[model samples]
Target: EGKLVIWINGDKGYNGLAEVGKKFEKDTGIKVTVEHPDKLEEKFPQVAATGDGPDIIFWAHDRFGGYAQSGLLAEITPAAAFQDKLYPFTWDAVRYNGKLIAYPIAVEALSLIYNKDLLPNPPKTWEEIPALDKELKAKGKSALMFNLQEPYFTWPLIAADGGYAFKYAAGKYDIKDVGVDNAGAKAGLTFLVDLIKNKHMNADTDYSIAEHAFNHGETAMTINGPWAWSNIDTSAVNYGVTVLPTFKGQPSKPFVGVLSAGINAASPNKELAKEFLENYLLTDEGLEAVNKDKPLGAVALKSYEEELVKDPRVAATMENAQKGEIMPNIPQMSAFWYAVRTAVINAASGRQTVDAALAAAQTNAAAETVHCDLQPVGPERGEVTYTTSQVSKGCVAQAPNAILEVHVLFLEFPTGPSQLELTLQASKQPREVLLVLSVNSSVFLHLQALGIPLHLAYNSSLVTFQEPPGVNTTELPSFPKTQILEWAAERGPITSAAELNDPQSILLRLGQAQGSLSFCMLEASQDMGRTLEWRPRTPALVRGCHLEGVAGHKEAHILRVLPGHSAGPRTVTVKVELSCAPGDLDAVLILQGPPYVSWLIDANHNMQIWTTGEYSFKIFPEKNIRGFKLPDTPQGLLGEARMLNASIVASFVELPLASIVSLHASSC
Candidate 1:
């Protein structure tokens, strides 16, 4: 019996599969060798086509379609009873044109992870985020931080608004129906823009920043998947995981994917592979053994999935997955990542208006549809709608195939170059704008400004906004020549009364003055309306280190004391005055003295520092504390580990302080 070769993608779950492979070798008297490739997905298709591939390919189920279509995968041995044991969606990922093509193994998706210390309970709705932001900011922390530009993370927001990757039906993808730019998608984009406008989040937040912020406690919560769990320190972080909250009265839906094992059509051992898959790999005993080695995803087996859900971590992710649609494996999806991602990046960076960004993406997607031939020509006309709280407006666009018809609403703000003086003033009442599109269409309101864009504020019960952008110009063109609305003088009392009088506050309340607006169209579905809950734009200032309750201390200056080059003992004393009630000040003091030395003092001595007249310290340099010899290149070490002024700070100190401090410093 020759060895039964297995190729795994070296993801987090390999250890479990490796152990299963070893056991199969022992029990079945079949030699099994599992080899992990750096990029198995990329390499397997090419290798499998040449008839030199492994008997089994272990990877995500999303790639099954391409392989199966290319005749590179053998038809999975059908077992109705076994199929019933797994989640239905897991099968969806492994099926190609209704044919089950892979063995389902595990499921994964994104959910909300929050620091229990900052938020006692997870938020139930998107509306609660603003308040969460306010409360967290009071403690010098951010509320929700996620990679704003990554479509994978932001897709849920768009999906909540009825956006989708492709129109999936009849067990196949309708490549022509690209819905990334639909009206619901616009709503999702608008929500993200509002987050930026309110200063609760920034477009600059990338995956690294978002992950670091959560891991280091800079943010109270983040949206991420199980893949990131390995990097999070449960000991240092008292956190809880839960499904993402609703957006605009709808639950956020993330993309769900499954990990699976498929038999290579090119393998000579198809029967053995099939037997290994049916009799051993997919069995409860087999899955349980793999899980024991590495706790990865929710096992596709219904019994295992049910058992795993008992843990809150797995339960939260499963709930989110239940709400999400599986990622399409059709080759047409190749264009989605690039086309949709560009729109998110542009809108987030303020390089283009939200509507313009989506239109550009639609154009790119249309180009992709033409290349993917499996798509039968789509309906020349179809309908979709967009909705809001106040009103619904509908429009139509004609396309050759299943193309997107876009309707854009653009607004011009007061602070534009043309608006040097005040013509319009802020209103005291909250205003609302309603926009409705067809069921297949999408819409977004764009507020154009000379500087950074601004959004409305909540005036107790109502959200306000400037006048509509598309009103003055109803017959606007789409894409190619969509004019960038410039700032106009008559548009605003350039400066708000609040700003001119108070000097401290600069923003015009939505009720006080309107910014500007313009609208255009692209291609999409039936009619739907979206209401703009227009609130006034109020002054919000970037916060600095400050004391809230300390009577005389108005500001707390962060100090950094860097050490000079010396190979001897070092002594440092940090002298500062701190006045606060017991448990009031829990700030961690970070000290970096000597080339490679650092220390973090917790607030366990919150009031003690204030009680003692002087803060004192004693220091002795050690030749080697960890039994590791210092490299001769101390200069290189110093250059890499040099501490800067205004050192980064954390709120508290917990277990594994060394590892925690290292990651925290790198983030800074």
Candidate 2:
């Protein structure tokens, strides 16, 4: 296999890499086939899931989350010299779930594109828009217009008030939290309302309307990306691109999307692809191919930025990009945008008040955010790290319909204050995991082929698989799930060797879902992973692990840690109930009061320490333990945890009641 394959959109900027690809072919003696796939984005997941896709693909940053979550993309680690050399924003664009999933090649965002002859200087603040409108409309022309209802173009103004769509902190998205209805958002929505109701812009304008207006020279200015400049260049009007004006109080922040090259998680020629990535895009002759056909709008390569400054288009876009935010790349945004679009149309068209519209947007967005349904949250098993795991490179069936087993080793996950970190497994070189919601029987060989590498307990009567309303991920037919898994006994390690031969349990049986996906596992307490031992096939789930209260009848389950409990760390065992469904389990004891941690003995007799808990309760964490609950009724024990506490009594004197929460565990 002295070859590397690539799938790129027929349009956009493929020439840059392909040009470099040929140079690579000549020197390395490796054939690089650059195929222009029709609607490559639409075809990727299926091909990738089957280990038959391109070695690499060019993509819009928005699709990264979708592909990554589906386990269709590979994580790449370029050298630090190359990494730190790229712009930070561009660096962030390629990272998903804390891993660099692709290579950022270019950055683009909406900039203030204007007709220089009509408006010699673009307004520097949004406050100037209304005044310009008054002057321009009086002359039988519109001052500005560009998809008035399109959030992508209007978000900069929204940033003036409404701000963020989701709370993003420390490289993660708080999908549960939204600002669509906050006071600032109310003001931002009102701004749009005024644009329509107050005669500042048309109520029914469409993207086509804005495009025609700008290209036909009917509007003095518009907001657009360099992608639109190629069309505008054909018009007779003299135009110039500039950084967008702010809202006076704050800078405008539009969605800054990166164009990237992502490796297929299932590709066979991975090393060759990685080598090609390094040999191509970073070269001067390479990036230059796109300089003409695809304007280097905010070139992502720091080395190329200075060289491209000769083009004002690149300069303004780079300047504007510096002021924008990366568009939300999570899969949940699909639900968010639909709800937001409805609210914007309703409020901007006078069909609903701004406040009411945003309220509905928030409610709908929250309601539609898909929930996971896997019931087994335990430390017993670890997840497959797609990079080296067979989960990405599926197996071949021995016969036409060889029935095989996808062995599940064990699972590991760590929890934190209101956030979930990552999954862990014992396989050396292993690093990632994905909830396999689907597989195509026609293409099935094993999990990685059509590689939906997950198989666990499935109850058709109660299971609901979550998919974005109309996402076209695959052509998988009805629910004739070809394979499934179950607890060999009451509970232990949930897997089989169908291969009984894969020494490493990397297997999958094709299966069939519409409700929430319920994949569950525990996120470890920081530094405590070394403390717990994996004991598989142990049926366990600890629920209601709270202190009995002063009378064992008090409603508050507080661990009177000050003057109470015992002379030593009080040892208690929380009850583990049986259930296949999903629900919260809690412990009356918590440690939110202190940032450090304490240890406890699990039923399996291993010491357990919980991760940082959320402050949902003056009440420790979940019910005091989103953490303590071992998750679902069908999981094995990672040294099944019970409640144990109170040795460092001297530190408790600072506060009367030390609250601790988060870290769910249970033992059978």
Candidate 3:
């Protein structure tokens, strides 16, 4: 190939590779193009599953497992030589079932970041948090804050008590043996609940709310990572970072992850990519380039350690990384986050007991852990069985003419599962749906009506059912958004037809999400309230398998809290960021409210760094210049005006267009 393509997430800083590209082109006439497409993690997999991904993908390590299993990622045996330089550590994070799929670059883990000015002495143990909360709360300050809703942050609490994603031994993960519901993990769950119950923390804390509190000096401490500096580095608070305190005298293990780059299996430039990763990208020089923009908390390549820890922020993260565990890079690992998070929310809200919440989570995790990516929708996407976790086996069918075909989507089970349900009225006629199949299929167990007690027969044996939950009368707008279905089965030349003519017995929820297009032809596996579970049916053809629901409509609104926030920090200046493009330009913007807020464009969350091709406007309300247009150089930061906020907070906000304020923009 004459050229190689590299894909970088906006935060990955492939701009650091600028010099490497120059040297490579000078040596070999081959051109190297590094491109950053928006939403790389979400959209990249869609193309790569069928072999259309980039030649090289520089991303986090945990994401490659599913792709590798699908054969989208090429093995980089060259990484074998760098093992001694990196090792049993990061290598495992880049492997899928032991095959080296990508090379590791940077490493990151959570550390306790505290405002030194707020608390002169940091807590050394978890026990100290309760008292600290009491002390800080009296002064209207938070003792600690982190996204209680995110599994990444809560993993330490879980692992400290021995709860883990999957069982690992002899370098192999028994995906079937999940450890989340065990006693040790149970203790961790209880620990978090107690904090909320005891008023030591807030139940609604999320990354957005927590980060804001910390950035604005409202909180004394937070457990964050190197990437977090992209926001807090610009804050006025004098902060310090250190390892997380102990829980019950045992060290908590943060799920350490690697920033890695992999070669695409479908790419013709695989060998060249491997050569580049081993020789250039993974080298000290290449890694150093990336480090200039985004801090490299820890590097597997020991030679870069000296330069890496030189930054005190990176040093603290490195210390925490020493006690961390490599995040599992396996498909089954998907079952962990959603399960734990749901349990936490349930417990915090008092909606369910910790025990019951965890119990339900276990089932949901195991049930939803299965995934498949196949094409040309139909036959309600095959789940004809009790077998997932097989290295390579799935059922994909296509009934192009059949209105309901199966496409797979990989994401968390929606929070409001009940919002999606199949309603079967006792007065309705039995519905019959036609199903078309493609090639192989696998059937796991019994045939039972997941919702109402309707014995819908399949190509195999008979099945039973239960009472369908009450149908919701609310209708929301639906779009041809990215929706998909997946399936699994044994290899066999097969065809099956299901005559599910009984509309009174059909059970499936997916159709509820799609409006007006009434019937869905899918076999309902398990009925978990508003959700219907699925698995591959035994190798057979199902025809006229139909499910229908008459739904009502409603529009959901984003809630805005009010009043208590009547004031903000008495800061005089703030910055407005512009999507700096080429040449002189003109722009208009409006601040939307009476209580508008903003931040320093330079250090505003992910906007902290001033990368190439972007401009920063330092909007100091004190020095409003309506007379002159700004300069066009990278060194110049244009200024702008501010507006009102509802809550009387921050330095930036959107104007509702009606405000219609105009500003002059410039470029080189």
TM-score to true structure, per model: 0.50, 0.52, 0.52
Q: Where is model 1 more than 4 Å wrong at Cα?
A: 1-11, 28-43, 50-55, 87-89, 147-150, 169-172, 194-209, 227-234, 366-668
What lDDT is obtained when candidate 2 is compared to the true structure? 0.52
Q: What is the lDDT of residue 173 in candidate 2?
A: 77
State which candidate has the highest lDDT.
Answer: 1
CA lDDT, every model vs. true structure: 0.52, 0.52, 0.51
lDDT, candidate 3, equals 0.51
**Cα error of candidate 1 at position 622, Å:** 76
Q: How well is each residue in 341-398 modelled by candidate 2, as lDDT tens digits? A: 8887887788888878888988876533312111112333211111111111212211
Candidate 3 per-residue lDDT over residues 88-179, each given as its tens digit: 66887896765788888888888888999998799988878889999899999989989877678888877877877777898676666777
Error of 1 at 278 (Å): 3.2
Per-residue lDDT of candidate 1, residues 491-530 (tens digit): 2211111101001111212221122212212211111111
RMSD after CA superposition, every candidate? 31.7, 17.5, 29.1
What TM-score does prediction 3 earn? 0.52
